[PDB]
Symmetry: D3
């Protein structure tokens, strides 16, 4: 029973994220997408919306489930009966930041992190940039799953 957790805010989930989910689901018997919500409430979509968008965008991955994460990600990972986190990397700068978190996570809980390199076509896709461009009237529909596009179009209509 090999398993990985894919943690993130997913606000909203992008096609870059879905790519990572697919790639994790191909290599681990079970994948859990863990949505870690910002407490301060500064995000675009609420938690219920973020969950629905991930679920709606991952109906083709039978071995993937979606859950809200609470506390340290390592504690969530251990509560799933797993010892691996899977995350995507776009750049060397991303790597150096994630490296610190991964080494810390291994230190405190013995939980390992496996990184996958972004698909080339989604290298520039982030939730933040997608939101920024969307908020200014730009068309980012090709970078996001249709379930997200539907919701985005409803907010600007």
């Amino acid at each position: 029973m090999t398993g990985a957790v894919c943690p993130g805010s997913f606000d909203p989930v992008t096609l870059g994220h879905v790519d990572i989910f697919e790639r994790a689901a191909a290599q681990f018997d079970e994948v859990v997408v863990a949505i870690l919500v910002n407490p301060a409430k500064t995000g675009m979509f609420d938690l219920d919306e973020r969950i629905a968008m991930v679920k709606e965008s991952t109906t083709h991955l039978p071995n993937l489930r979606v859950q809200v994460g609470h506390g340290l990600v390592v504690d969530f990972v251990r509560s799933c009966g797993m010892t691996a986190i899977v995350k995507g990397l776009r750049t060397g700068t991303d790597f150096e930041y994630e490296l610190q978190m991964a080494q810390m996570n291994k230190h405190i809980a013995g939980v390992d992190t496996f990184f996958v390199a972004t698909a080339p076509r989604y290298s520039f896709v982030s939730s933040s940039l997608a939101k920024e461009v969307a908020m200014l009237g730009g068309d980012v529909s090709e970078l996001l799953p249709e379930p997200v596009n539907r919701r985005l179009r409803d907010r600007l209509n």
Copy 2:
């Protein structure tokens, strides 16, 4: 039957490498260490020696096997009935180099690459630097498995 290939020259295998092997073996049902030898013959240890050093240093990993790699790593991976490569990363510079190879490997064969961050204590360990220091009389025994230390000490004696 989840499985990963850990490719490299391993000339010689270091404790950084063994760390990666252990971490891969913890998350995949099967791990294959693939030794890719330089054709030009520029290395310190011959292929037979490199194989023995890896085998001798991995007797504690029952689900790991060691094999000589030939051709494209993706072809070797596919010949193992696998679709994943696992490699370690120390720095952002490493990442940008490996990113290119990973995206190329995915393009040509659909084989994915999972990276793990170096253990902090082995961040500066490479086969090349270990060899360079050893060749100049420095003591690198704490950075290498005893099976490698034994062989290194025999070459300088």
Copy 3:
């Protein structure tokens, strides 16, 4: 009619910025400096002041004009009848950030971005650091155009 837009907050414009303007003006028939103001109002100089400082510091560039930017930079670029943005880069870290924006801008509007490497002597010059040092009593007059120096000295007097 080759043309480029040089976008930024320019708060205030520095000699690093003016260097980029000069270099853009040398290679494109027309250059438009686009001042994109922060809506939240968190900047040191107001928009009118920023415009005046850029204009006053660029009187030697006949093919350059200064305009306030609104909305997506790509929309502004297209409204100028142009398809190129020109920006300066100081470091690899800068590059990886700007790379994302450039690829996004190309995706959404087909607008390209041309980067120029900082002049060595201005490599450490940013508006932010200049302001931080100025606010603490440091002398940054050699890093800024005289029109900016005049205004800075008036705020601290």
Copy 4:
């Protein structure tokens, strides 16, 4: 008469290179592709072949010409009556290397360098990696212009 030189070994030219040529040709009245050949003779294709491959792959760019470069690139640029070099960048590591060359080129001859960010889909494409994979039997035909593919297939047949 705005103009840029796009220098490189182009051994062979890739679709990443052609992308840069197209993007340069869109912004400058004239583009000159300068093929700088390695004297030591270590390349895959000879100079005549490299020229033909670039020419054959750029028949859609009326304002682009192809020439063999000799000496310092800045001297070649000046001999074209130009003051700009255009090059592509894939990563921050690329940038830091090219930054040194650009600042040196500006110092010695006042020739400026404009960089463009790689198209996402060609981020992992290099002549070197394409050749390495091709030499090992991998299929890189989707990364190279047909005129290059034709010649590559003839060498391995």
Copy 5:
């Protein structure tokens, strides 16, 4: 009378910081740890607490003293009768940020900066990450001096 200033917020001081202090104290006749407090008051420990934690964690360094810093660090350095700042670096990204500050500091006051590379075992240790993990119930006691651990345990008890 060679001397260096080691500036920072030290909120709280970590074993990574203490490592730097020890290494500076080994090479300079005098070391001054300068605590620069955030005016906005956003930190975990107050200034008095930060001073005490540094002092309590450095009782083994006879040539080190601890002082609160005010204004530009270069002005503080000069007020100590010194011309050197010493700081630790973990990553290339850290370096590019610190490089800007160091060049600025040299420009405005002729004060130089000497960097030391992190000890491998503390590469992932930062005050910020330690605090974040501590706030979520994680155990970071092995990354911090006992005087800090005592105070941390008192806040969560």
Copy 6:
């Protein structure tokens, strides 16, 4: 008796190198420039020439001496009765490479490394690039000490 060793090939010494020497000599009671020669004999200037160029370019630094280095730099450092190496850094990429060497040097001999950031004006200066440009007829005289310029001009005359 604080002291540092500044190791390198210095082939030839540049104004960037001399800048580092001056900055080291300002902070340490004694500085030793250690010339480590390539055994394979691939350099431009012989060892005697490199020594003379460094000596001739450092007559203004009374506390600096020049010596040929043999073996591991850490062994040379210890033979000087010192425990510090001083080196310059230009970029984050430089840092990640030097970081490995510094951590290795500390591991094997307890010798520490202090890095200084390049002066902005010499950021693009390296011995290698200076030689490459010089060999092609470019003028690099403003990047090198006059004692080096004299010798360079004699080789091309």
